[PDB]
Structure formats: structure tokens, C-alpha cells
PDB file of N, CA and C in Angstrom:
ATOM      1  N   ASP A   5      93.137 -62.685  -5.067  1.00 53.07           N
ATOM      2  CA  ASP A   5      92.534 -63.467  -6.052  1.00 53.07           C
ATOM      3  C   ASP A   5      93.515 -64.223  -6.904  1.00 53.07           C
ATOM      4  N   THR A   6      94.667 -63.710  -7.082  1.00 55.60           N
ATOM      5  CA  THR A   6      95.771 -64.326  -7.946  1.00 55.60           C
ATOM      6  C   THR A   6      96.059 -65.721  -7.512  1.00 55.60           C
ATOM      7  N   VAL A   7      96.066 -66.042  -6.234  1.00 56.33           N
ATOM      8  CA  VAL A   7      96.249 -67.348  -5.811  1.00 56.33           C
ATOM      9  C   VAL A   7      94.902 -68.017  -5.334  1.00 56.33           C
ATOM     10  N   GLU A   8      94.244 -67.457  -4.275  1.00 57.33           N
ATOM     11  CA  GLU A   8      93.117 -68.101  -3.720  1.00 57.33           C
ATOM     12  C   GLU A   8      91.899 -67.997  -4.648  1.00 57.33           C
ATOM     13  N   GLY A   9      91.675 -66.792  -5.241  1.00 54.91           N
ATOM     14  CA  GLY A   9      90.441 -66.465  -5.934  1.00 54.91           C
ATOM     15  C   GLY A   9      90.237 -67.282  -7.221  1.00 54.91           C
ATOM     16  N   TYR A  10      91.334 -67.489  -7.956  1.00 53.58           N
ATOM     17  CA  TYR A  10      91.185 -68.100  -9.262  1.00 53.58           C
ATOM     18  C   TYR A  10      90.863 -69.534  -9.133  1.00 53.58           C
ATOM     19  N   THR A  11      89.802 -70.015  -9.929  1.00 53.74           N
ATOM     20  CA  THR A  11      89.451 -71.285  -9.984  1.00 53.74           C
ATOM     21  C   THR A  11      89.134 -71.663 -11.403  1.00 53.74           C
ATOM     22  N   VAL A  12      89.242 -72.934 -11.729  1.00 55.95           N
ATOM     23  CA  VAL A  12      88.918 -73.384 -13.135  1.00 55.95           C
ATOM     24  C   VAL A  12      87.375 -73.240 -13.357  1.00 55.95           C
ATOM     25  N   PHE A  13      86.539 -73.650 -12.377  1.00 55.75           N
ATOM     26  CA  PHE A  13      85.147 -73.656 -12.539  1.00 55.75           C
ATOM     27  C   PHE A  13      84.714 -72.181 -12.786  1.00 55.75           C
ATOM     28  N   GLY A  14      83.759 -72.079 -13.644  1.00 56.20           N
ATOM     29  CA  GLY A  14      83.146 -70.720 -14.009  1.00 56.20           C
ATOM     30  C   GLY A  14      81.701 -70.749 -13.681  1.00 56.20           C
ATOM     31  N   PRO A  15      81.045 -69.603 -13.813  1.00 56.34           N
ATOM     32  CA  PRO A  15      79.538 -69.558 -13.648  1.00 56.34           C
ATOM     33  C   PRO A  15      78.936 -70.314 -14.762  1.00 56.34           C
ATOM     34  N   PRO A  16      77.741 -70.946 -14.375  1.00 55.41           N
ATOM     35  CA  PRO A  16      77.006 -71.746 -15.382  1.00 55.41           C
ATOM     36  C   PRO A  16      76.564 -70.922 -16.574  1.00 55.41           C
ATOM     37  N   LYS A  17      76.598 -71.585 -17.760  1.00 56.92           N
ATOM     38  CA  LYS A  17      76.101 -71.011 -19.007  1.00 56.92           C
ATOM     39  C   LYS A  17      74.538 -71.080 -18.897  1.00 56.92           C
ATOM     40  N   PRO A  18      73.948 -70.202 -19.771  1.00 56.92           N
ATOM     41  CA  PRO A  18      72.537 -70.279 -19.825  1.00 56.92           C
ATOM     42  C   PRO A  18      71.871 -71.543 -20.228  1.00 56.92           C
ATOM     43  N   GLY A  19      70.739 -71.987 -19.650  1.00 55.94           N
ATOM     44  CA  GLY A  19      70.106 -73.233 -19.828  1.00 55.94           C
ATOM     45  C   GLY A  19      70.738 -74.345 -19.145  1.00 55.94           C
ATOM     46  N   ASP A  20      71.633 -74.038 -17.965  1.00 52.60           N
ATOM     47  CA  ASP A  20      72.380 -75.078 -17.420  1.00 52.60           C
ATOM     48  C   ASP A  20      71.514 -75.834 -16.390  1.00 52.60           C
ATOM     49  N   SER A  21      70.459 -75.192 -15.757  1.00 50.21           N
ATOM     50  CA  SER A  21      69.630 -75.777 -14.810  1.00 50.21           C
ATOM     51  C   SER A  21      70.308 -76.117 -13.433  1.00 50.21           C
ATOM     52  N   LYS A  22      71.602 -76.036 -13.426  1.00 50.37           N
ATOM     53  CA  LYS A  22      72.281 -75.891 -12.174  1.00 50.37           C
ATOM     54  C   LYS A  22      72.006 -74.560 -11.463  1.00 50.37           C
ATOM     55  N   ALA A  23      71.914 -73.584 -12.199  1.00 52.80           N
ATOM     56  CA  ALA A  23      71.442 -72.236 -11.716  1.00 52.80           C
ATOM     57  C   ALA A  23      70.056 -72.305 -11.047  1.00 52.80           C
ATOM     58  N   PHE A  24      69.281 -73.331 -11.332  1.00 49.63           N
ATOM     59  CA  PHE A  24      67.920 -73.485 -10.670  1.00 49.63           C
ATOM     60  C   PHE A  24      67.976 -74.471  -9.509  1.00 49.63           C
ATOM     61  N   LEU A  25      69.040 -75.188  -9.357  1.00 48.99           N
ATOM     62  CA  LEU A  25      69.261 -76.004  -8.166  1.00 48.99           C
ATOM     63  C   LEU A  25      69.539 -75.092  -7.039  1.00 48.99           C
ATOM     64  N   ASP A  26      68.955 -75.427  -5.795  1.00 50.03           N
ATOM     65  CA  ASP A  26      68.864 -74.608  -4.637  1.00 50.03           C
ATOM     66  C   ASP A  26      67.795 -73.523  -4.686  1.00 50.03           C
ATOM     67  N   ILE A  27      67.175 -73.316  -5.849  1.00 53.07           N
ATOM     68  CA  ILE A  27      65.791 -72.888  -5.961  1.00 53.07           C
ATOM     69  C   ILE A  27      64.857 -74.152  -5.950  1.00 53.07           C
ATOM     70  N   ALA A  28      65.455 -75.206  -6.464  1.00 53.08           N
ATOM     71  CA  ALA A  28      64.833 -76.545  -6.498  1.00 53.08           C
ATOM     72  C   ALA A  28      64.694 -77.014  -4.996  1.00 53.08           C
ATOM     73  N   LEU A  29      65.734 -76.750  -4.207  1.00 49.57           N
ATOM     74  CA  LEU A  29      65.735 -77.269  -2.852  1.00 49.57           C
ATOM     75  C   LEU A  29      64.783 -76.531  -1.912  1.00 49.57           C
ATOM     76  N   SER A  30      64.661 -75.165  -2.162  1.00 50.59           N
ATOM     77  CA  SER A  30      63.598 -74.438  -1.420  1.00 50.59           C
ATOM     78  C   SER A  30      62.223 -75.028  -1.647  1.00 50.59           C
ATOM     79  N   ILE A  31      61.869 -75.253  -2.952  1.00 52.03           N
ATOM     80  CA  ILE A  31      60.566 -75.798  -3.216  1.00 52.03           C
ATOM     81  C   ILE A  31      60.470 -77.234  -2.742  1.00 52.03           C
ATOM     82  N   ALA A  32      61.514 -77.960  -2.612  1.00 55.06           N
ATOM     83  CA  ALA A  32      61.478 -79.421  -2.306  1.00 55.06           C
ATOM     84  C   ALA A  32      60.762 -79.606  -1.004  1.00 55.06           C
ATOM     85  N   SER A  33      59.635 -80.471  -1.157  1.00 59.36           N
ATOM     86  CA  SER A  33      58.817 -80.988  -0.118  1.00 59.36           C
ATOM     87  C   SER A  33      58.598 -82.443  -0.189  1.00 59.36           C
ATOM     88  N   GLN A  34      58.791 -83.169   0.817  1.00 58.13           N
ATOM     89  CA  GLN A  34      58.719 -84.556   0.860  1.00 58.13           C
ATOM     90  C   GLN A  34      57.218 -84.994   0.537  1.00 58.13           C
ATOM     91  N   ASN A  35      57.115 -86.076  -0.068  1.00 55.41           N
ATOM     92  CA  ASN A  35      55.722 -86.770  -0.472  1.00 55.41           C
ATOM     93  C   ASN A  35      55.274 -87.728   0.401  1.00 55.41           C
ATOM     94  N   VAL A  36      54.000 -87.733   0.802  1.00 55.54           N
ATOM     95  CA  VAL A  36      53.588 -88.838   1.736  1.00 55.54           C
ATOM     96  C   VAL A  36      53.367 -90.192   0.899  1.00 55.54           C
ATOM     97  N   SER A  37      52.722 -90.103  -0.179  1.00 58.99           N
ATOM     98  CA  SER A  37      52.415 -91.300  -0.944  1.00 58.99           C
ATOM     99  C   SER A  37      51.629 -92.310  -0.180  1.00 58.99           C
ATOM    100  N   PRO A  38      50.378 -91.982   0.246  1.00 56.74           N
ATOM    101  CA  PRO A  38      49.588 -92.812   1.201  1.00 56.74           C
ATOM    102  C   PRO A  38      49.389 -94.238   0.556  1.00 56.74           C
ATOM    103  N   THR A  39      49.222 -95.137   1.482  1.00 59.21           N
ATOM    104  CA  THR A  39      48.917 -96.629   1.057  1.00 59.21           C
ATOM    105  C   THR A  39      47.657 -96.697   0.265  1.00 59.21           C
ATOM    106  N   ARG A  40      47.695 -97.518  -0.805  1.00 57.63           N
ATOM    107  CA  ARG A  40      46.546 -97.776  -1.642  1.00 57.63           C
ATOM    108  C   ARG A  40      46.033 -99.081  -1.636  1.00 57.63           C
ATOM    109  N   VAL A  41      44.885 -99.372  -2.027  1.00 59.13           N
ATOM    110  CA  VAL A  41      44.341-100.616  -2.183  1.00 59.13           C
ATOM    111  C   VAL A  41      45.056-101.349  -3.339  1.00 59.13           C
ATOM    112  N   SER A  42      45.336-102.685  -3.119  1.00 57.80           N
ATOM    113  CA  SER A  42      46.072-103.454  -4.047  1.00 57.80           C
ATOM    114  C   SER A  42      45.271-103.683  -5.347  1.00 57.80           C
ATOM    115  N   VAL A  43      45.936-103.828  -6.400  1.00 55.51           N
ATOM    116  CA  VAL A  43      45.275-104.126  -7.706  1.00 55.51           C
ATOM    117  C   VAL A  43      44.520-105.469  -7.598  1.00 55.51           C
ATOM    118  N   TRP A  44      45.025-106.437  -6.805  1.00 56.00           N
ATOM    119  CA  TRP A  44      44.419-107.739  -6.605  1.00 56.00           C
ATOM    120  C   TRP A  44      43.146-107.532  -5.858  1.00 56.00           C
ATOM    121  N   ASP A  45      43.026-106.575  -4.880  1.00 57.79           N
ATOM    122  CA  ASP A  45      41.811-106.407  -4.235  1.00 57.79           C
ATOM    123  C   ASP A  45      40.763-105.582  -5.155  1.00 57.79           C
ATOM    124  N   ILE A  46      41.208-104.884  -6.061  1.00 56.31           N
ATOM    125  CA  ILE A  46      40.262-104.203  -6.949  1.00 56.31           C
ATOM    126  C   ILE A  46      39.615-105.067  -7.943  1.00 56.31           C
ATOM    127  N   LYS A  47      38.406-105.074  -8.093  1.00 49.94           N
ATOM    128  CA  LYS A  47      37.491-105.837  -9.059  1.00 49.94           C
ATOM    129  C   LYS A  47      37.475-105.135 -10.340  1.00 49.94           C
ATOM    130  N   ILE A  48      37.873-105.823 -11.387  1.00 51.96           N
ATOM    131  CA  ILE A  48      37.982-105.186 -12.801  1.00 51.96           C
ATOM    132  C   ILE A  48      36.575-105.064 -13.308  1.00 51.96           C
ATOM    133  N   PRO A  49      36.130-103.759 -13.765  1.00 50.30           N
ATOM    134  CA  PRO A  49      34.713-103.613 -14.204  1.00 50.30           C
ATOM    135  C   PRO A  49      34.365-104.502 -15.435  1.00 50.30           C
ATOM    136  N   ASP A  50      33.096-104.818 -15.473  1.00 49.63           N
ATOM    137  CA  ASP A  50      32.529-105.647 -16.559  1.00 49.63           C
ATOM    138  C   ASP A  50      31.856-104.652 -17.592  1.00 49.63           C
ATOM    139  N   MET A  51      32.208-104.869 -18.878  1.00 51.43           N
ATOM    140  CA  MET A  51      31.667-103.940 -19.911  1.00 51.43           C
ATOM    141  C   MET A  51      30.666-104.607 -20.764  1.00 51.43           C
ATOM    142  N   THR A  52      30.117-105.820 -20.386  1.00 50.83           N
ATOM    143  CA  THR A  52      29.292-106.593 -21.315  1.00 50.83           C
ATOM    144  C   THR A  52      27.757-106.082 -21.244  1.00 50.83           C
TER     145      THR A  52
END
């Protein structure tokens, strides 16, 4: 430890949210985001 073990970096403090990264990565799922109709194609409703 005296040579190899010791490092300046320490464990994260509470509220760091680094502690929740790699729990973030497990949940991480890619999004499809399917193609939508263009706003130009959509006809704006009439309220008269």
C-alpha cells in the first residue's frame, strides 16, 4: 500500500452522483426515436 496502494483520489462524498454512475450504465438503453410527421405536413387546427 505504501507505494502502490496510496493515491490522491478518494472515495466520493455523499451526493456526488459519480457513485450512481455504472448503475446509470446498467440501466442505460438506447432510444429508437422513430421518424415523425413533419410540422409542415401537419395542418394546424382551426378554433373559429
